[PDB]
Amino acid sequence: NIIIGAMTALITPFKNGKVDEQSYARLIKRQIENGIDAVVPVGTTGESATLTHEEHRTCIEIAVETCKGTKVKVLAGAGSNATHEAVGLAKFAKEHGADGILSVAPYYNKPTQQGLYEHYKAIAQSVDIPVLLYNVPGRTGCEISTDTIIKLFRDCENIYGVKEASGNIDKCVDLLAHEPRMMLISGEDAINYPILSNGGKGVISVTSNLLPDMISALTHFALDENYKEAKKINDELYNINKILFCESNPIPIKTAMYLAGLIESLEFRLPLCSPSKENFAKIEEVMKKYKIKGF
Template sequence: MTADKSLKLEGVYTALITPFTADGTEVDYEAFEALVDRQIAAGLDGLVPMGTTGECPTCSKEEKEKCISICVEKCKGKGVVVIAGTGSNNTAGTVKATQEAKDLGVDAVLIVNPYYNKPSQEGLYKHIGEINKVGVPIVLYNIPGRTGITMSAQTIARCYEDYDMVVAVKEATGSLDLASEIASLCDITILSGDDSLSLPLVSIGGKGVVSVLSNWKPERVQSIVQNALKGDFATAAENQKKNIKLLKTMFIETNPVPVKYSMYLEGLCQPTVRLPLCEMTQGSIDTLTDVLDECGLVTKESAQKKARV
């Protein structure tokens, strides 16, 4: 485990889904292990278990720890970074979860802005300060659509400058203006939190993406991000154009519902999500399968055969 800003993040990091059994009562660990193996084989740069896409709010402490442990054990010695989601709206609880993840051997933790409480910028700064004391690299997570609050560029820069464990930010505000402002204020590593914005974000200095689509089609995300990081923006842009409809369709309903359903069509997991998330409407399923068919990934006929009754 790296203990300072020497942890350099760059590339494609998969925001892992958490596969459940058909009835949703248990984590399907066999499917999860197969997913992790598939990610490693695809050459992904890192895995992010128990984030938004992993449905962390509806997973138990034991489920979280087991999924994180599986990632750590399987990625050991393979150059694949494990960034565990440990953030919550309870500072003491986040510190405890972060310490536990550190003890499991993660390379870094993903700390979402506290939701519901609506802390001030000073509160956000102090929250990160407490987590910093644990001594594991921190990736800040700015996602106001889920939390109701945005960490400002100034607060991000302040955290980066004052706290030795803050190494990166997952920028999921959808604002390239904010990302540009962050880059102008400090040298923190910026990772896109939106698949469709990874290319423009790299063009202004970002270093990669925490991806949803790479759960299912890692090579499609890599074809955009890796070319952009090499400076081949023409090829990256061409690949972005080819995949933009697919990238957008993964969010026609609340993430991770569409990506889980897509993976289900290929037999990689059950489409099950836990309440209060629920299955897609038939209209969304029809839209999704139309796009997948258009992209040559799943035929409408095979999707209809696989559809749940």
């Protein structure tokens, strides 16, 4: 059981410091109507760090409910650097109708490979829905090694692949060569096409928040082996794909969504904050080059 294809790491819109739940539902519906295959509530892009556990839960529920009666899957953000917390989130997602969970490598405490293994095993054994690993060492301070990922995929029935955001093409090659059953998911927008053309089966995208049609089309073109068309969109997207990381994600994507009139308010929770006026200008300029779907 797997979750693949074009997916969106949903931004979490705030209004006066709280999640704007109507806005959230509306943004999710906008994803659905633009051909997206799955949404990821409360990943990194959704400011998982600054949402309380109960708000985190509410967002997951809104995604499930908004996606009900549609083919769009909900891959709920359920990671934590504490296994008991990650287990709690995983169980909740399962109990509340999520289709799978995305579970980021523990940040800050730098577990050993053995610890990572037990972390994810405890999580995968706690629910019967697909678990996607999520490697992003630049943020977590640790890496799930290729051996650990493969071992987890083989030992745990529900662990089905990994979202890679380690900027390491070679590891991606290794993963699929040793374990071609696993689903490699691009966590790096700029190289969506190369990852897909090289055996990856989906993306969890930041850019698709703004340009869901473009990211969905890219992903589907590639899965269909229409590489020319997929490369073409990837090339077109390169500028925005890079600019959306001029400051730590999701600062730029939220800024663009606001500039586009897709969210009412440009609000973060500290320590995240508005970009510098210079990057605000930079984001505004790149944005003009693209056609941005409305509601």
